Amino acid sequence: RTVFSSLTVNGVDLGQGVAVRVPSSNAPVTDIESDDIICNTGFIQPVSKTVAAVPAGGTVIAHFHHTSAGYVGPDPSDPLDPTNKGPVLAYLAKVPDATQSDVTGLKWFKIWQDGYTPATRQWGSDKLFINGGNATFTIPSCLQAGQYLLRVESISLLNAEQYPGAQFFLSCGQINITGGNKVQPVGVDFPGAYTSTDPGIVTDIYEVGTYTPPGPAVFSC
């Protein structure tokens, strides 16, 4: 189990819970047809009204830890339980106001993922564990400036040999992309993008040879 609960932007730490809608527990979302698949559920109140200014092309760290508290010292399952093999993914959606409570009917484009490397038997979850929960990626430099939600997701496939089984640990960050250009990428729906026929969601990790994470191709400028 794991929770995304803080951000670093171009090396500046914003603070625990700042500009992130932090779910109250580290319980997974398991229903890919639920609106809970968009940004999780049951947020710690009051929800942050910080919207992080991020230049297009800038480097962001989405911080995962075992619990919604963030870092509370040594813990063998911090940032996640290393037995929980699976991918890590990051998506953006353009939103009128990054503090708005309604997150339905947005168009999500994938900006980064780390799946599985067969030759080394290493999963994105392993890399995230090694990096102390630091999921690090860049914001595409060509994007239209404005308010966006940043959906960052860790999937455990330990029990994913049937659906339901995959465990989805995710949160949404609140950002304001500055600079940039005029590109407005095509996005997918949440719910909708993930289905029970996706081999990225139904997978036996003890029978895996090749692996493709669920959802659309990564967007690049």
Ligand X SMILES: *[C@H]1O[C@H](CO)[C@@H](O)[C@H](O)[C@@H]1O
Ligand Y SMILES: *[C@@H]1O[C@H](CO)[C@@H](O[C@@H]2O[C@H](CO)[C@@H](O)[C@H](O)[C@H]2NC(C)=O)[C@H](O)[C@H]1NC(C)=O
Interface with ligand X (CB under 6 A), residue from 17, 58, 173, 214: 58
CB 196 → ligand Y: shortest distance, Å? Answer: 35
Can you spell out the DSSP letters for 98-132? TT-S---S--EEEEEEE-EETTTTEEHHHHHHHTT
Burial of 207 (0-12, 13-18, 19+ CB in 10 A): exposed
Q: Please choose which of ligand Y, ligand X, none residue 92 contacts, taking the beta carbon within 5 to 8 angstroms, the exact cut-off set by kind.
A: none
Q: Please choose which of ligand X, ligand Y, none residue 31 contacts, taking the beta carbon within 5 to 8 angstroms, the exact cut-off set by kind.
A: none
Q: Which residues bind ligand Y (CB under 6 A)?
A: 8, 13, 61, 131-132, 134
Q: Please choose which of ligand X, ligand Y, none residue 59 contacts, taking the beta carbon within 5 to 8 angstroms, the exact cut-off set by kind.
A: ligand X
CB 154 → ligand X: shortest distance, Å? Answer: 21
Q: Please choose which of ligand Y, ligand X, none residue 138 contacts, taking the beta carbon within 5 to 8 angstroms, the exact cut-off set by kind.
A: ligand X
CB 27 → ligand X: shortest distance, Å? Answer: 32
Which distant-in-sequence residues (6+ apart) come within 8 Å of 59 by Cβ? Answer: 9, 10, 11, 136, 137, 138
Q: And the tokens for 202? A: 């139904």
Q: Please choose which of ligand X, ligand Y, none residue 15 contacts, taking the beta carbon within 5 to 8 angstroms, the exact cut-off set by kind.
A: none
Q: Please choose which of ligand X, ligand Y, none residue 122 contacts, taking the beta carbon within 5 to 8 angstroms, the exact cut-off set by kind.
A: none
Q: 88 has which bridge partners?
A: 114, 154
Is 77 or 131 the residue whose CB approaches ligand Y more closely?
131
x/- string (CB under 6 A) for ligand X, residues 107-146?
-------------------------------x--------
Which distant-in-sequence residues (6+ apart) come within 8 Å of 101 by Cβ? Answer: none
Is 24 or 134 the residue whose CB approaches ligand X more closely?
134
The beta strands (E) that lie in 40-191 are given as 52-55, 59-65, 88-94, 108-114, 116-117, 122-123, 134-138, 146-156, 167-178
CB 114 → ligand X: shortest distance, Å? Answer: 15
* Amino acid identity, position 126: D
Range list of H helices, the chain: 36-39, 124-130
- CA–centroid distance for 36 within its chain: 13
- The site that binds ligand X (CB under 6 A) totals a number of residues, namely 4
Point out which residues bind ligand X (CB under 6 A).
Answer: 10, 58-59, 138
